[PDB]
């Protein structure tokens, strides 16, 4: 569901 991922430079989780 969310977008938690590894990226671009650090890690990035936006809870969509």
């Given at each position: 569901?969310?977008?938690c991922h590894?990226?671009?430079l650090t890690w990035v989780c936006?809870?969509?």
């Open positions: 569901t969310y977008s590894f990226g671009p936006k809870p969509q």
